[PDB]
Amino acid sequence: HMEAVQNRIVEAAERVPGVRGVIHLRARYVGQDIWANMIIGVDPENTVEQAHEICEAVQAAVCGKIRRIESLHVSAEARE
Amino acid sequence: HMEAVQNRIVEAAERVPGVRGVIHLRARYVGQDIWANMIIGVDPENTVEQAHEICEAVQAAVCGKIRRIESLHVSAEARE
């Protein structure tokens, strides 16, 4: 029953400047810890550097709000 | 192990305009649901009506962010 935690991850991610939706989220329990992988949408006209910064901001925001997450990998794809 | 959920309640409550800290929070599981009772601080110079509105706003904010809560009673006390 991972809906509640995944809902929290998505909402946290979406509240970060530059996030155009969560394209993909795979979360799994490793013991009582969550390890996750996420792909966010970003403006196709952002620079690669900006997209990297937005990914780092999502990582901080999400990990800050969901204490059980012990690994979170965030990548980005162009989204209009 | 109610720390994580109680931390979430407190943080949610504090982010509501007019909340001057959480003075008291008693939360308990009833099955897999949380029932809670909270006292917030408010400006002593707010009206009784305003304090009521702030309590209602905390109730909405908290219940909106913590899905397992099925009852939340919020009251207010003067805090400088």
Short mmCIF file of C-alpha atoms in Angstrom, two decimals, chain B residues 17-50:
data_model
loop_
_atom_site.label_atom_id
_atom_site.label_comp_id
_atom_site.label_asym_id
_atom_site.label_seq_id
_atom_site.Cartn_x
_atom_site.Cartn_y
_atom_site.Cartn_z
CA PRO B 17 -1.63 32.04 9.13
CA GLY B 18 -2.25 33.13 12.76
CA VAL B 19 -0.80 30.01 14.41
CA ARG B 20 1.66 30.91 17.17
CA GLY B 21 2.92 27.40 17.85
CA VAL B 22 1.20 24.16 18.82
CA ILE B 23 0.74 24.29 22.54
CA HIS B 24 -0.65 20.77 22.85
CA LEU B 25 -1.20 17.72 20.63
CA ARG B 26 -2.68 14.39 21.70
CA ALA B 27 -2.92 11.86 18.91
CA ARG B 28 -4.00 8.26 19.12
CA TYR B 29 -4.65 5.40 16.75
CA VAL B 30 -8.22 4.06 16.49
CA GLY B 31 -7.57 1.13 14.21
CA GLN B 32 -5.40 2.49 11.43
CA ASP B 33 -6.99 5.98 11.80
CA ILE B 34 -5.67 8.88 13.83
CA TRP B 35 -7.92 10.82 16.18
CA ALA B 36 -6.34 13.94 17.62
CA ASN B 37 -6.87 16.89 19.85
CA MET B 38 -4.79 20.11 19.44
CA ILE B 39 -4.41 23.51 21.07
CA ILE B 40 -2.83 26.29 19.04
CA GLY B 41 -1.42 29.58 20.23
CA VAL B 42 -2.94 32.75 18.73
CA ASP B 43 -2.37 36.54 19.04
CA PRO B 44 -4.21 37.57 22.33
CA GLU B 45 -5.51 40.58 20.36
CA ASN B 46 -7.26 38.50 17.69
CA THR B 47 -11.01 38.35 18.15
CA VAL B 48 -12.69 35.15 19.36
CA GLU B 49 -14.16 34.90 15.80
CA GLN B 50 -10.71 35.16 14.23
#
